[PDB]
Design a protein around this nucleic acid. Structure first.
Ligand code: FES
Ligand SMILES: [K+]
Ligand SMILES: [K+]
Ligand SMILES: [K+]
Ligand SMILES: [K+]
Ligand SMILES: [Mg+2]
Ligand SMILES: [Mg+2]
Ligand SMILES: [Mg+2]
Ligand SMILES: [Mg+2]
Ligand SMILES: [Mg+2]
Ligand SMILES: [Mg+2]
Ligand SMILES: [Mg+2]
Ligand SMILES: [Mg+2]
Ligand SMILES: [Mg+2]
Ligand SMILES: [Mg+2]
Ligand SMILES: [Mg+2]
Ligand SMILES: [Mg+2]
Ligand SMILES: [Mg+2]
Ligand SMILES: [Mg+2]
Ligand SMILES: [Mg+2]
Ligand SMILES: [Mg+2]
Ligand SMILES: [Mg+2]
Ligand SMILES: [Mg+2]
Ligand SMILES: [Mg+2]
Ligand SMILES: [Mg+2]
Ligand SMILES: [Mg+2]
Ligand SMILES: [Mg+2]
Ligand SMILES: [Mg+2]
Ligand SMILES: [Mg+2]
Ligand SMILES: [Mg+2]
Ligand SMILES: [Mg+2]
Ligand SMILES: [Mg+2]
Ligand SMILES: [Mg+2]
Ligand SMILES: [Mg+2]
Ligand SMILES: [Mg+2]
Ligand SMILES: [Mg+2]
Lengths: 122, 167, 94, 94
RNA sequence: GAAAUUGAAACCUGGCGCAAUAGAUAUAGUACCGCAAGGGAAAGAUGAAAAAUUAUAACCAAGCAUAAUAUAGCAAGGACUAACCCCUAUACCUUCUGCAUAAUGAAUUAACUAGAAAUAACUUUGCAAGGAGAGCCAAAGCUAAGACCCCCGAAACCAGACGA
RNA sequence: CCGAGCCUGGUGAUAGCUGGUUGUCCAAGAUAGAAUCUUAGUUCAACUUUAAAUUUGCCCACAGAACCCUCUAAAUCCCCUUGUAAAUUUAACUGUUAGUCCAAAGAGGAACAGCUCUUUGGACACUAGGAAAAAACCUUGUAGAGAGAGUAAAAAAUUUAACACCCAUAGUAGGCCUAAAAGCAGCCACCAAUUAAGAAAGCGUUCAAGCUCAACACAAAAAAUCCCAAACAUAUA
RNA sequence: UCUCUUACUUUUAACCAGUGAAAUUGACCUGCCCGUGAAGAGGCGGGCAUAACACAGCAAGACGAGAAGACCCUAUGGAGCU
RNA sequence: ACCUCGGAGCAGAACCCAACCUCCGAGCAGUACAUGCUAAGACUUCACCAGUCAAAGCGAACACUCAAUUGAUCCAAUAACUUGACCAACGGAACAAGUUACCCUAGGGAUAACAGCGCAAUCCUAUUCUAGAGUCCAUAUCAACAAUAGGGUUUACGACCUCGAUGUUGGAUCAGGACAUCCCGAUGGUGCAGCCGCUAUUAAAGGUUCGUUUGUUCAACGAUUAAAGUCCUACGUGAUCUGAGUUCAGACCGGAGUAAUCCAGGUCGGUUUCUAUCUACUUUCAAAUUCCUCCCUGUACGAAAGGACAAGAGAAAUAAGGCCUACUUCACAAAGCGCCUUCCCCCGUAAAUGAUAUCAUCUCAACUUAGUAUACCCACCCCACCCAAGAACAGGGUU
């Protein structure tokens, strides 16, 4: 019979060679996720379809921001083969009230607060 | 069909792709080991037979003074034993030693110029008393038996030297 | 074509996504007066603001919930101290 | 010649299917993306204890909005102006 | 499926009936069919004047004619300078898990041919502890309206007649 | 058109059966079962629809759910957080339930069937692209226009068999048993002359003879109309 | 009758003239091979062939046409008979 | 045989979960005699109907055991309390069996037989293995336990397609195709002297008979032949034919049944429609196979008995294509029983030279050798007549 999957805890245990490969820091884990569905919920079990709806991943290739917390991570580990997970980086910091209209999420995972649409003078 | 079948059941395409991707890849060295200079072979301990021959060979050159070097032709065993019986009558021995054992002995020794003689099947005719005259007539029975040479009393002599010494 | 190269340059795999080619207004008046914003650009601005406001809301909520847990742990530590001050031993100990 | 008994891709004797070179590359590309997902799920920002109760107020308020909308369902008001405006169908010139 | 009991107005000269495949079958129970009982049609179209035929002009179904056909293919679509040539495309309905299916039905044109009922509930008005133009219902009901329930086909059975 | 004439009437007989069931547009919308003179049907439930009321629903952290029983199974049930927005009850009824194939666990058959029968999940009866054509495999869904763009799945590999050179006399036909069986019909022991040789590993003799070797030296394929895209080992993924 | 058929006449036949049906018919601009598919393809896939066109023959195909065929099964459908 | 109810396996861990499934049962008995009266809250065999547990209270003492051990409503009985069906078809109709090929109607490819298709248990074939037969000897042949693949000819299994006009079998006609070759051809081995044989590789160009009983397919034997191949093709072909066996109504024999009536048996008889719309096709312009006799030759071979190759000749037969001088059916002609003509190799192997691997070795090494096409057809007056030309048209002649 085909049923759900219990992923062993050892799978989600980053090795020291992985921190030098993906650029992450275990001492200072990132605060927010950037989840993007890259696979169809079709031909997948119904429980995977429901979790996609709960995470707001209906439309494909539409980035969504989630919190890096165990309860949210629990849902991600179920549909981890249908989404792309990237950390959210803040080179300029959290957007303020005056920077809401100037935000832009680049493909690298960084959210800039000054989207000037102007070539760099440097 | 059943999970286990007598014939090889066809795998699902997703499973078949998984098997193909997860195939063993042997490590490939940057330079093939055969082309690189191989390390020197480990030393080979000498066989007890080889070190036994050296002691026996050294005795021959020291005990008996006359040594005759000849080519051990492919004579019939009946004719080869009969000549040995004729040589035993005149107290003449017919000793045969391998070249790969005898050559190294003569490489560093007094009898250093006898090295080129031992090429192929060779036999040694030795005796304490140099009965050259009695030996020559025995070897004249077979015209195809060559007398390479010898060394009598620490003096190297050719076949003609034995003929002169016999007379 | 070229989607992989663009992602390595910090751009979008699809050039129509964002950048000068798409975000800029497609036309303007001859006098120089700016054109009214296009419908697609207005939709993207609203979508980006909602994404930005969610990022601020999610980050603030985690910090607010982290301070509360830190405060409760401090409160639990203090409660142990208060109970110890009650009365002094007597009898064998004195 | 070359008949496959029954249907092609079902049955005991099916038409053999082989994995192409790009098919292997596509699967490897998928694996690399998911292998990176395992890395980012191994570093939670907060533990289970810290996370607890950090969004109870927002979740409670969110459902109260659903209850308010669900309990506000009622027929719309009926105005007397709209009933009289149907008499305009017979408006004409003198 | 009652009865006691209760008690009703009542002005023929009309039509949100049909208009020649409709309305009676009806131009007629004739033609025609059957030994008999019995069954049972079809259709007509000028004008004030035919004692104006110099007449009741044009256009309109399928079917033809005007005007046979040119590689290739569910006959079309995307197109194109251009009909074809190029590219793409497994007729329709019904019955089945599944029909391009070599499963059913249809040559085609025109006309005709198949969802009727208000108990409850709902919706919208009136009045309201009452509602209703006797009766009936009522612990917010009661009165009124609106809004849901097809067509063709057996082999048979019985009664009375007509036939050797 | 006589296993019961024809005609009229009852009669618009009845048919759980067959066929048909007429304008436009939008929306929601599929596979648990039980009973049945019942399995070509119907009723109820499940599911589905609308309206209405209400508040939790789904996901799920520990904790928790048996012993005789180690297929010590995959995994459920319960379940706060959390992610989310549904769920329950009330009112009114219709309709579907002669299912398929794929993956997986296990039955029946033959560890056959496009076989039959359960369970979990997917797809199909909902669109499109790709597997040659293709209901069930893979990619992918919420709907329009464009002579824009980025991508998903997506192109089968493989060609297999050379090989020793030279040499060999002898205590002996080792005894037993056998017509005689001698290294080789069988057997008990397997020492030994000689630089170096099995009281013999195979052949050939009724038995012997003869021979070689050991020793010194030097991995297939064949069916019926007619094979079947054309091809191409070498310009930087 | 056949080995083993053959000749001839008549009718039919074909052509000219006159008269003039019927079953049939989703639409067809109606090819072959191989493969595929609801398991037997003129229409799908891959190859090959291919100006148009009437008349006369032929009967392999169009699961050809003609009476919901015969044949088994179903119905709380009929009838005869015992 | 089975139909209701319960337990165990499938169903391994909450519940649930099917057969033709894999196993065993139950239709009771016993102890009570408060096995009394009432009442919160729950379970529930996937609905309903039924079924199960139960605190407290009243009243007494000081929710019986058992997995199943059961039957609704109506009705009847009864003062009442209560009781009543192997209604076992067990969600139960108050009470009803056979037969129909004399059959009828409505449907069904949900569903049978024939066929097609799936599958390869069975069947069939080749290799692998080397035990064992073959005087000796696995491998001239043959073959066990098995193994590895292929084939889709039988017997089965599946019920997917066809129930709104194919009965099936066999024969006649004409056949196309496969090669796993019966014959002709080529070539290894042989327990191959020569003839005969056996076996293996190659070869599908050509051929593969006529009869008696039988519906026959097949088979039996009759005579032959170089041989009388195995199959497939809608178990080819039935809008080409046959209707003998089976199949509808009649009847008989034997059998079953009270009878009606039935039959995997025997016997007799028994309607086989169609005017071609479409596709395809309608002179493959022309290369032939085989036997016998003779010669070589009574030669090689053999001790004799026996007895061949290759090459050449003759004769005959069929097949293909023509013709009418005879013969014959017949007569300005057609026709055969008559006459005439007929033209290529076949690549399985057998050997040289010669390296890898200084020999040798025929070479999926370079190389060498043996077997490794022709003919026919070809122009461009026409009214009408004639014609050896012809359905029409076309074609030839008209001097
Ligand atoms: S190529 Fe390096 S040893 Fe030959
Ligand atoms: K029924
Ligand atoms: K035909
Ligand atoms: K019953
Ligand atoms: K037919
Ligand atoms: Mg299975
Ligand atoms: Mg097929
Ligand atoms: Mg009328
Ligand atoms: Mg017209
Ligand atoms: Mg085309
Ligand atoms: Mg009567
Ligand atoms: Mg009379
Ligand atoms: Mg009559
Ligand atoms: Mg009716
Ligand atoms: Mg919709
Ligand atoms: Mg009953
Ligand atoms: Mg040797
Ligand atoms: Mg005519
Ligand atoms: Mg007609
Ligand atoms: Mg055409
Ligand atoms: Mg075909
Ligand atoms: Mg085709
Ligand atoms: Mg024709
Ligand atoms: Mg005909
Ligand atoms: Mg029934
Ligand atoms: Mg229940
Ligand atoms: Mg029952
Ligand atoms: Mg029950
Ligand atoms: Mg009879
Ligand atoms: Mg062959
Ligand atoms: Mg046949
Ligand atoms: Mg036939
Ligand atoms: Mg036929
Ligand atoms: Mg007959
Ligand atoms: Mg008969
Ligand atoms: Mg002839």
């Amino acid at each position: 019979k085909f049923t759900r999957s219990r992923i062993p805890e050892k799978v989600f245990q980053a090795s020291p060679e992985d921190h030098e490969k993906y650029g992450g820091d275990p001492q200072n884990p990132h605060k927010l996720h950037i989840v993007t569905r890259i696979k169809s919920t079709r031909r997948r079990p119904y429980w995977e379809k429901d979790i996609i709806k709960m995470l707001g991943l209906e439309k494909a290739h539409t980035p969504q921001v989630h919190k890096n917390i165990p309860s949210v991570n629990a849902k991600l580990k179920v549909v981890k083969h249908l989404i792309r997970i990237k950390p959210l980086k803040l080179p300029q910091g959290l957007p303020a009230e005056e920077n809401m209209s100037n935000t832009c999420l680049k493909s690298t995972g960084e959210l800039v607060v000054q989207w000037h649409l102007k070539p760099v003078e440097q | 069909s059943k999970a286990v079948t007598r014939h090889r059941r066809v795998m699902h395409f997703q499973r078949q792709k998984l098997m193909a991707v997860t195939e063993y890849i042997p490590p490939k060295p940057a330079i093939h080991p055969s082309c690189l200079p191989s390390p020197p072979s480990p030393p080979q301990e000498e066989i007890g037979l080889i070190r036994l021959l050296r002691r026996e060979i050294a005795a021959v050159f020291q005990d008996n003074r006359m040594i005759a070097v000849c080519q051990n032709v492919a004579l019939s065993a009946e004719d080869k034993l009969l000549m040995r019986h004729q040589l035993r009558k005149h107290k003449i021995l017919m000793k045969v030693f391998p070249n790969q054992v005898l050559k190294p002995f003569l490489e560093d020794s007094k009898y250093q110029n006898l090295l080129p003689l031992f090429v192929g099947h060779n036999m040694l005719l030795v005796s304490e008393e140099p009965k050259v005259k009695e030996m020559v007539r025995i070897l004249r029975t077979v015209p195809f038996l060559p007398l390479l040479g010898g060394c009598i009393d620490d003096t190297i002599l050719s076949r003609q030297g034995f003929i002169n010494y016999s007379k | 074509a070229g989607g992989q190269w663009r992602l390595q340059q910090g751009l979008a795999a699809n050039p129509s996504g964002y950048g000068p080619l798409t975000e800029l207004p497609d036309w303007s008046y001859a006098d120089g007066r700016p054109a009214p914003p296009m419908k697609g650009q207005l939709r993207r601005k609203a979508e980006r603001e909602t994404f930005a406001r969610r990022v601020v809301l999610l980050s603030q909520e985690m910090d607010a919930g982290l301070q509360a847990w830190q405060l409760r742990q401090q409160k639990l530590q203090e409660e142990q101290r208060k109970q110890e001050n009650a009365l002094k031993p007597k009898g064998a100990s004195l | 010649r070359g008949r496959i008994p029954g249907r092609q891709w079902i049955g005991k004797h099916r038409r053999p299917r082989f994995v192409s070179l790009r098919a292997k590359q596509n699967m490897i590309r998928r694996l690399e993306i998911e292998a990176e997902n395992h890395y980012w799920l191994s570093m939670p920002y907060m533990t289970r204890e810290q996370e607890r109760g950090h969004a109870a107020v927002r979740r409670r308020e969110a459902f109260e909005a659903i209850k308010a909308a669900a309990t506000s369902k009622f027929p719309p008001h009926r105005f007397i102006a709209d009933q009289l405006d149907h008499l305009n169908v017979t408006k004409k010139w003198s």
